[PDB]
Design an enzyme around this catalytic site. Structure first.
Site, PDB file in Angstrom:
ATOM      1  N   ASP A  79       0.855  -1.197   0.000  1.00 30.46           N
ATOM      2  CA  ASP A  79       0.000   0.000   0.000  1.00 30.46           C
ATOM      3  C   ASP A  79       0.896   1.254   0.000  1.00 30.46           C
ATOM      4  O   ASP A  79       2.032   1.207   0.428  1.00 30.46           O
ATOM      5  CB  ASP A  79      -0.891  -0.033   1.264  1.00 30.46           C
ATOM      6  CG  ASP A  79      -1.908   1.141   1.308  1.00 30.46           C
ATOM      7  OD1 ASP A  79      -2.653   1.312   0.287  1.00 30.46           O
ATOM      8  OD2 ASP A  79      -1.942   1.890   2.316  1.00 30.46           O
ATOM      9  N   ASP A 126      -0.387   5.148   0.609  1.00 31.72           N
ATOM     10  CA  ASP A 126      -0.698   6.308   1.446  1.00 31.72           C
ATOM     11  C   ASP A 126      -0.795   5.901   2.887  1.00 31.72           C
ATOM     12  O   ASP A 126      -1.568   5.038   3.212  1.00 31.72           O
ATOM     13  CB  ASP A 126      -1.961   7.018   0.947  1.00 31.72           C
ATOM     14  CG  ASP A 126      -1.812   7.507  -0.501  1.00 31.72           C
ATOM     15  OD1 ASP A 126      -0.797   8.132  -0.849  1.00 31.72           O
ATOM     16  OD2 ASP A 126      -2.671   7.216  -1.332  1.00 31.72           O
ATOM     17  N   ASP A 180      -2.358   0.022   6.025  1.00 31.87           N
ATOM     18  CA  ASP A 180      -2.672   0.758   7.267  1.00 31.87           C
ATOM     19  C   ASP A 180      -4.146   0.782   7.598  1.00 31.87           C
ATOM     20  O   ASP A 180      -4.485   1.150   8.719  1.00 31.87           O
ATOM     21  CB  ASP A 180      -2.289   2.212   7.141  1.00 31.87           C
ATOM     22  CG  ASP A 180      -3.107   2.928   6.082  1.00 31.87           C
ATOM     23  OD1 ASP A 180      -3.168   2.384   4.994  1.00 31.87           O
ATOM     24  OD2 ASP A 180      -3.737   3.969   6.343  1.00 31.87           O
TER      25      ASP A 180
END
Length: 223
Positions: free
Chosen positions: A9, A11, A185
């Site tokens: 991932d 961001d 996240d």
């Protein structure tokens, strides 16, 4: 075969910011999206309506692509380089670089998997040495971005579809690997986290941290 797959991932996982919002804000500030104030106001109001549940994920993605539709791709490139230099690059940390580098060095097949559009994220994958990008793609026709999404968005369950489509394009599949890692996240990415053999909650939100602990998933607080 012994190869592993490593998916990242972007961001808030590899970067301590949201590259989608920072790009909008960068265009507002700088001000290539109209009067700066109204631009930032319109950006925030999009995020607010999306966050309150009043806009679809498609519509939020569309507003973001509409920022590309307003300009020549030659201008957009010049402006993105400034964005890379002034916003993205200085947020690169040795910890994030090293998580990627370890998998590169092991021989892993590595890809960045991100909802932030491929115009915005292509040079960021390159900044990490990552050769594969599985991002929401902006439709480009007749030399300009149209404001529409091309194909399946790399968001939520779409990340799973896109990853499986990409592997098949190379003549591979998820079970060809001895392990598959995905770092993220966000609870948005539980779909892909559930699909691989080694999910890693990186800088997790409280929601994802709870899910990680429940299930024994590795947690890493990179920054």
């Amino acid at each position: 075969t012994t190869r592993r797959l490593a998916l990242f991932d972007l961001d808030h996982t590899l970067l301590p910011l949201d590259s989608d919002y920072q790009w909008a804000d960068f265009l507002a500030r700088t001000g290539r999206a109209g009067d700066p104030a109204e631009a930032r106001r319109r950006n925030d109001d999009l995020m607010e309506r999306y966050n309150r549940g009043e806009l679809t994920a498609e519509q939020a993605a569309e507003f973001m692509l509409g920022l590309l539709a307003a300009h020549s791709p030659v201008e957009l490139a010049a402006w993105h380089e400034e964005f890379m230099r002034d916003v993205i690059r200085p947020s690169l940390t040795v910890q994030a670089v090293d998580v990627v580098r370890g998998h590169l060095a092991a021989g892993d097949l590595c890809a960045l998997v991100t909802a932030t559009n491929s115009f915005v994220t292509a040079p960021i994958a390159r900044a990490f040495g990552v050769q594969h990008l599985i991002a929401t793609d902006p439709e480009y026709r007749d030399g300009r971005y149209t404001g529409r999404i091309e194909g399946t968005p790399s968001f939520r369950e779409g990340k799973v579809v896109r990853v499986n489509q990409w592997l098949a394009g190379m003549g591979l599949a998820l079970g060809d690997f001895a392990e598959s890692y995905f770092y993220s996240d966000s609870v948005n990415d539980v779909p892909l986290l559930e699909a691989v053999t080694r999910p890693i909650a990186a800088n997790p939100s409280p929601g994802l941290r709870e899910i990680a602990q429940a299930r024994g998933w590795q947690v890493i607080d990179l920054f």
